[PDB]
């Protein structure tokens, strides 16, 4: 079994996604995404071997008929998904990059002499890396996996197949305290002006933590307003809001549509309603009560009510979120909120492996 991602980190964390070029993985239909992982010889889990983009049904090349059942098997692109590490852990970042580059070299040999065969659980020549196979019911094939023989491809990785996910303590969003926080706050959807706006709206209120409440308000409002902007732009059906009722033609399949996720640039990966937990019951009520008018002053009553309710009931920004991540003291853990960089920016390029 592929180990689950560690959930706790002392400070800011980072994870990477690396979609490979030059090969496919074929597996039975409705197989689990994870088919293996790469760890250090010391035992530290570095990245998962996963199926990503469905490339159509698998057809075993006739010249490689082996008496085995490949019925209903699907081909997919391979994506290497790192186990998160600390952002300032140079060794862990580098080991992940080096392990991903080594596996690409291993994959290059694999498609040359073992095309249309599963990957074997092996140790690297230098002893540094170990492949563990969690699902042997797979095959690795060159290119798009139609031909029995390869075109002599070198397995590569490119910025277009790359993503990064940054996890920070939820209490820090809006403080600009660290370079990671400042990078996350640069998100085009984040409106820092909402912090001082909340302070102006709550002068007569005796809040338990005024600065924290303002930070949570600015974060949540920014997400709610962006969700409403996207629902209007892309014609998305949110809760009970119908875009067609406002003469908007849908041009996206929902919140999880790649182009909707790309429109965020820095995509929130955690359930918005989780942040309410970092505040007192009183402060959370004060924050929540002030959000509705921010939506209603910019958007229709129906869109406003539907966006507000969706996130209030635990609605996700773009599908299943990473909602069990924590930061700080292991014994008294604090909520971590995660963000996916749809394109890896210059500030995070050093966390990504490069073929060239
Ligand atoms: N606690 C954490 N802190 C930081 N990063 C994390 C944490 N937990 C997971 N991640 C990272 O978040 C990313 C999540 O990858 P995941 O495969 O789960 O999403 P996905 O389904 O692949 O998204 P996509 O549909 O775009 O491929 C990984 O890069 C992982 O390393
Ligand atoms: Mn991703």
From Swiss-Prot:
Q: What stretch of the parent protein is included here?
A: 727 to 1082 of 1163
Q: Where does Mg(2+) 2 bind?
A: 17, 79
Q: Which family would the database say this protein is a member of? A: Belongs to the VgrG protein family.
Highest taxon listed in the record's lineage: Bacteria
Keywords, alphabetical: ATP-binding, Host cytoplasm, Ligase, Magnesium, Metal-binding, Nucleotide-binding, Secreted, Toxin, Virulence
- Knockout or disruption consequences: Deletion leads to a loss of TseL secretion and in turn loss of its ability to mediate prey cell killing.
Q: Is Kinase among the key words of this record?
A: no
* Reported function: Part of the type VI secretion system (T6SS) specialized secretion system, which delivers several virulence factors in both prokaryotic and eukaryotic cells during infection. Forms the spike at the tip of the elongating tube probably formed by hemolysin co-regulated protein/Hcp. Allows the delivery of the TseL antibacterial toxin to target cells where it exerts its toxicity. Also acts directly as an actin-directed toxin that catalyzes the covalent cross-linking of host cytoplasmic monomeric actin.
Q: Which organism encodes this protein?
A: Vibrio cholerae serotype O1 (strain ATCC 39315 / El Tor Inaba N16961)
Instruction: Quote the record's binding site residues for Mg(2+) 1.
Output: 17, 163, 340
GO process annotations (BP): actin filament depolymerization; isopeptide cross-linking; isopeptide cross-linking via N6-(L-isoglutamyl)-L-lysine
Q: What is its main location?
A: secreted
Tell me where in this chain the ACD domain is found: 2-356
Identification of the protein by name: Actin cross-linking toxin VgrG1
């Amino acid at each position: 079994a592929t180990p689950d991602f560690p959930t706790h980190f002392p400070k800011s964390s980072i994870g990477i996604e690396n979609e490979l070029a030059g090969l496919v993985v074929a597996m039975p239909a409705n197989s689990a995404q994870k088919f293996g992982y790469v760890k250090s010889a010391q035992g530290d889990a570095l990245f998962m071997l996963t199926k990503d983009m469905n490339q159509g049904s698998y057809q075993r090349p006739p010249s490689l008929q082996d008496g085995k059942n490949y019925q209903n098997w699907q081909t997919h692109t391979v994506e290497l998904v790192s186990y998160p590490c600390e952002m300032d852990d140079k060794a862990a970042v580098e080991t992940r990059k080096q392990a991903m580059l080594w596996l690409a070299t291993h994959f290059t040999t694999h498609i040359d002499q073992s095309n249309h065969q599963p990957l074997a659980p092996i140790q690297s020549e230098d002893g540094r890396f170990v492949i563990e196979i969690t699902n042997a019911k797979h095959v690795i094939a060159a290119g798009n996996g139609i031909s029995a023989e390869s075109q002599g491809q070198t397995i590569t990785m490119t910025p277009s197949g790359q993503q990064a996910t940054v996890g920070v303590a939820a209490k820090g969003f809006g403080t600009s305290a660290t370079p990671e926080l400042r990078l996350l706050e640069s998100a085009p959807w984040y409106q820092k002006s909402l912090k001082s706006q909340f302070a102006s709206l709550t002068s007569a209120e005796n809040l338990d933590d005024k600065e924290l409440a303002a930070n949570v308000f600015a974060y949540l409002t920014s997400i709610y307003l962006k969700t409403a902007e996207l629902a209007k732009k892309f014609g998305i059906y949110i809760n009970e809001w119908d875009p067609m009722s406002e003469q908007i033609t849908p041009n996206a399949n929902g919140l999880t549509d790649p182009k909707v996720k790309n429109a965020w640039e820095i995509l929130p990966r955690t359930k918005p309603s989780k942040i309410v937990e970092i505040l007192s019951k009183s402060d959370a009520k004060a924050v929540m009560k002030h959000i509705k008018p921010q939506l209603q002053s910019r958007y229709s009553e129906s869109l406003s009510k539907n966006v507000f309710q969706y996130f209030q009931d635990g609605g996700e920004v773009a599908g299943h979120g990473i909602n069990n991540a924590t930061v700080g003291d292991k014994h008294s853990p604090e909520l971590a909120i995660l963000f996916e960089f749809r394109t890896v920016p210059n500030e995070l390029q050093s966390y990504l492996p490069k073929t060239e």
